[PDB]
Every structure is written in C-alpha cells, then in structure tokens.
Design a protein around this ligand. Structure first.
Ligand SMILES: CN1CCCN(Cc2ccc(CN)cc2)CC1
Ligand SMILES: CN1CCCN(Cc2ccc(CN)cc2)CC1
Lengths: 344, 353
C-alpha cells in the first residue's frame, strides 16, 4: 500500500513525482476505515517542482462508470476537486487545504447563504445521466425490501427493528408517495447528501463572505427533486456526527431551521438558480417563496424516510462504529414529528 | 440498414426521451426518428432526431448519435467525457451500460488521398500537437506500445487456423521469427528518444472529421474522433502511425478490402511540412529558435517518427492476425497483416536499421 500508493503516484503524477524514489515518498492516512480510505501523499519539502504539478495529493481507495464520469466532469468545470489519476481500485484527487463545517455552522447566515448559492449552481449543471426522477423512491423501495428481509442476531437489534416495522413501513411509504406526487418540484442534478461533513471550509478564505465553501462527495448525486436536496440539507441541521460516545451522533429537533432561517436560505438559492428571479415583483417573490417552503418541508419527510431505511440496512452490514439503529429510530421520530407539524 | 430493428429504437427512444432535455422528454414513440449509420455487431451507430415539425424548447440538440457497444470501459468513458468538456471531442449527452448518446457533427470522413493535401496535413498536425499537450488522469508510463505488441504476439503464437489459405499466410508470417524481431525492434526504439504524451494511437483518415460548413476555413475544418486506443505513449508512434496511414486505403470495395501503396508514404518534404505545423503548435518558444537549431530538432524528430513508424507496422500487423481468428467482420486481415510486415521490412531497409 505504501508501495502501491508510491507506484500510483510515481506513474500518474507529472513533474517531480516521475523521478521520485520510494524512500522519498511521504504518505500518511487522512481517513482509515474499510472502504474509501483517504490518504495524503506528498513530495519532500526539499524537492522543487518541475512544472505545475501538485506537491500534495489525496488518494482514495474504493476499498461503477457513472461516479468516475461525474467526478471528471465536476473537476473539468472547477466544481469539484481536480482528478489527477484514475485506476481500477481507486483514484488520485486534488488535496484541498480545508476543514469540514460543523453542524452548528450550518445556521450561520453567511454559511447557509453560500451553501444555498452553491447548491443552486450544482443544480443547474447538465450531466450525461438519466433525467427521469427515479432515484428517490427507487432507492427507498430498494431499501425497504432489504429491511423486510433483514434478520438480526442480537436481541437488541431485533427489538429495535421490531419497533420500526411496527410503523407499517410499506403503507407509510405509500402515504409519503401520495403526498409528494401532489407537490411540484423541479428535477435537477442533486447532491443528495449535502450534510456538513460534505462541505469544505477552504482555508485562507474564512474571511471571504461568499466564497469560502466547496461541496464534495457526490457519491449519491443524481437527477432528483430539488426539494429533496434542500429538505435533506435542512434535516442535517438537526444531526451532529462528531459525538464521541456511542451512538456517535446527537439529534436535536429544536435545531431544525426556523421559518426565518428557511427564507434566508431560499432567498439565496432562488436568484442563483434562476437569474431572472431577482427582477420579479416583491409580491411574486413571496408567492414563490411561500410555495417553495411547503415544497421542501414536504420533501424533508423523504430525507427522514430514506436515510432511516438506509440506516437499518447499514446496521446489518456495516463495520463502521455508529449506532445505526438508534439513528434510524431518530430519523423516523423526526419523520412522524414533521408529519404532525405539517398536518399531513 | 436504414430501418433499425424493433427492439433497438424502442430502447433508443427510451434512452433519448430520458437522457435528453427539452422537447425530447415528452416525445411519443410514434414521432421518434432513428436511422442506421453503421451496422455490424460491435459499434452500431444510429442517428436519432426530433420531428422537423417539433420545436426545441431550449439547448437540446435536434439530432444525436446513438452508439451501441454491442459485443465487448471506465477509462474510455472518462476520456470521452473530458474531451467533450474541453471541446476536443463530441459532446456527451448520455452514458449507460449498452452505450452512449453523443453530439451529431455534420461531416464526412477524410479519404486516404486527402491526408496529403497540404492544408489538411498542417491542421492534422496542429490538432495532434494540441491533443498531445493535454493532461489526462491516466498512467503516464509509456508501457502501452510494447505491452500491447507483447499481448498480441503471445496470442498470435498460440492460434491455430483450419481454413488452408489462412494457415499458409500465418506460416509465412511466423517464418520471420516475430518474437526475435519484436526484441530487435525494442532495442532499436530503446535508443530513440521520444517525449511521452497523450496519443490518439489510431489517427487514420476514417477517424478524422471534415466538418460541414467549413471547407473554406484553412486551419479549422477538422476534428479528431474515436479515441478507443488512446493512451500515454511515445509521440513518435502517434505521428509515425499517421504517416503509415497515408499508405492504406480501406475504402476498396473488393477482397481483401484495402489497397496498400508504399509509394504513398509521405516524402521528406511532406513530413517536414507536417512537423513544421506540429512543433510550433506543440511547444511555445519553437517558432523563434535559431533557424539552425530548428533544423536539428526537425531532422532528429524525423528520424524518431520514421523509426517509430516501424512499431506502427508491427503493432497493427500483429493486431491484424489476432483479428483474423476472432473477428467476423469482412476484411482481409491476414492479407493486411502481410501488407504491414512487408512495409515493415521495406521501411527497415530504407532506414538501414
Ligand atoms: C449517507 N449520509 C446521509 C445520512 C447520514 N449519514 C449517517 C452517518 C454518519 C456518520 C458515520 C460515521 N462513519 C456513519 C453514518 C452520513 C451521510
Ligand atoms: C485499428 N486501426 C488501425 C489499423 C487499421 N485498421 C484496419 C481495418 C480497416 C477497416 C476495417 C473495416 N472492414 C477493418 C480493419 C483499422 C483502424
């Protein structure tokens, strides 16, 4: 691996990387794990670059074709990290000096204003993928059917899974389908996982007011209802994954964005998504806003439902230390709370 | 043949309707237009279009090219997407397991005898030099050339024909002792400096588009397409291979379905004219180096591309023998293998190597 990374870096990267010896190779882990291990490879500080090649790069081990075409495209358009090399068991990507946002930072008005802008821009991109909005319910159905086949060993998971099934998930899915079918929402290229863990604060521009963030990790990206990408992100205000004691997240329902905070986000989103929106009548803009509010708060329900089902699947299979079943139970609690709140 | 089959076209209609924007997304089957551009079993080509009475709503193309992979993949897909993003290849509208949907570019392909026309050649040299300066996310080790020839050689040595004429042709070719000859070629090219760049690797006339509405422009009427063989490789191979293609006409309508003419290989003058467009297009300062150091570069570069042209004959000669066992396409692959090795040894004699 330290050699594998050495070979991949020597062979895929230009400049000093070409003549690099193996005892000159600097690598360290950025994230271990079982799948998608991140690494930081870099030149001797005492090595001068020959061209415009990078000094430090991010390696990503997968641990099919669409994810690669996608990442290449975003790289080409300067929407994503640059792609320096791609191979069967991973790829070399640009290393972006940054940190991830924290949960509570999402509510900072400049941060959520720029996230809205960035998601709007992400949303207007054309991609060579299927533009039929199959993804949302196709994945929920795929997960549900996995869930009604999962058998757990340990009494606790059995107990928890038994509570979740008692909601009558198949019937509840139909009630959700019914509601969203009656809720218009333009299909656009969605990130589908726009949580704080996937938003870079680019270092050196913490002082920029509108250009300090980048969106990354598009493994779930597809054409999907705009409402889901926004409602999902709103849900993510509630969940903090940096908690260091099992179950390794906190949910806080009170942290869901207020009407005022929602209007602030979409008041950024809309002008960045349709460049003619800014010239509409004050009244019309509020017609569109009030209507969008209903839209994304309904699709928020699908965020809860989808990730709840996903969280149950991950329990049975994942190695990652995370209280998946407790998270599923949190997502469904927020699902039913949001139903009562909306009166739907 | 013009009419697609019922199966494909029903599937074509679905792909177009779901992958393309605008008027495409609400088209009915009954108003979908599709025409064959190439049959076969491997890369079927179709033209797909809106009715002419139907109005585009926005960006969407009125016509696209459907490409089915047929009987056979991430590197090729990524490469095609990148070149589209950079406006070097056809735009990519749709990608899926069975194939892709690409921009339709009104054009015909160049004829073999057009490769030598001065303005054509100059631009082909600019386009290729441009093609070479690109950064691509692939392995930058120049192992494709001999890796590929080695793969073909090993397959070639263990294929047994039945059919007699195929069998006799294979025997004359093995007479030459290809493995030793391959090694001989390695030593010769091992001593021949050539910059490793991103090569098309199959820059023949049928992979160059003459763009419609531009037959007047002098330096902007061509586009290079079909990059299935592309990879980081010795610059000499890419140009050498192109010079070799001057000699082969695949439009010949009877068996073996090509004409070889060694007399059509570019003259020293024509080669210089080509690399005279290539070099200022490939590197910055070149245009204004001492007329005396421009010549050393040119002369050396000729030696290089003419030596690497030997790998062109050897690679496709081997490829061709492999194709004679596995391909069902009507083409005299064995005869073409011999034709390539004739030129190889004839080229060897020319170079005194
Ligand atoms: C799939 N995503 C959307 C739903 C929330 N996920 C839950 C999660 C958080 C942290 C960890 C720790 N590896 C695992 C799962 C993370 C991202
Ligand atoms: C792979 N390329 C480089 C070598 C020349 N080839 C020979 C060939 C031409 C036409 C046909 C079509 N019958 C088949 C093979 C095809 C292009």
């Amino acid at each position: 691996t330290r050699r594998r990374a050495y070979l991949w870096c020597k062979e895929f990267l230009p400049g000093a990387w070409r003549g690099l010896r193996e005892d000159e190779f600097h690598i360290s882990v950025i994230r271990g794990g079982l799948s998608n291990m991140l690494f930081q490879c870099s030149l001797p500080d005492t090595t001068a670059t020959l061209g415009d090649e990078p000094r430090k790069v991010l390696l990503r081990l997968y641990g099919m074709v669409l994810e690669s075409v996608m990442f290449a495209i975003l790289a080409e358009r300067s929407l994503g990290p640059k792609l320096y090399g791609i191979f069967p068991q991973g790829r070399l990507e640009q290393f972006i000096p940054s940190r991830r946002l924290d949960t509570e930072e999402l509510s900072l008005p400049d941060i959520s204003a720029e996230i809205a802008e960035k998601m709007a821009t992400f949303h207007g991109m054309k991609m060579p993928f299927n533009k039929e909005p199959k993804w949302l319910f196709g994945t929920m159905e795929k997960y549900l059917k996995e869930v009604l086949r999962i058998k757990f060993t340990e009494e606790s998971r059995i107990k928890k899974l038994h509570k979740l099934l008692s909601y009558n998930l198949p019937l509840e899915l139909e009630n959700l389908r019914s509601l969203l079918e009656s809720t218009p929402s333009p299909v656009v290229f969605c990130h589908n996982d726009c949580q704080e863990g996937n938003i870079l604060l680019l270092e050196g521009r913490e002082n920029s007011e509108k250009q300090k963030l980048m969106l990354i990790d598009f493994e779930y990206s597809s054409y999907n209802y705009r409402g889901f990408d926004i409602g999902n992100h709103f849900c993510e205000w509630m969940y903090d994954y940096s908690y260091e004691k099992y179950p390794f997240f906190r949910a806080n329902i009170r942290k869901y964005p207020t009407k005022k905070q929602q209007l602030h986000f979409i008041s950024s989103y809309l002008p960045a998504f349709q460049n003619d929106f800014e010239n509409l009548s004050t009244e019309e803009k509020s017609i569109i806003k009030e209507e969008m509010l209903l839209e994304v708060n309904r699709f928020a329900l699908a965020s809860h439902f989808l990730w709840g089902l996903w969280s149950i699947v991950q329990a049975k299979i994942s190695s990652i230390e995370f209280g998946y079943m407790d998270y599923a139970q949190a997502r469904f609690d927020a699902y039913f709370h949001q139903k009562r709140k909306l009166g739907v």
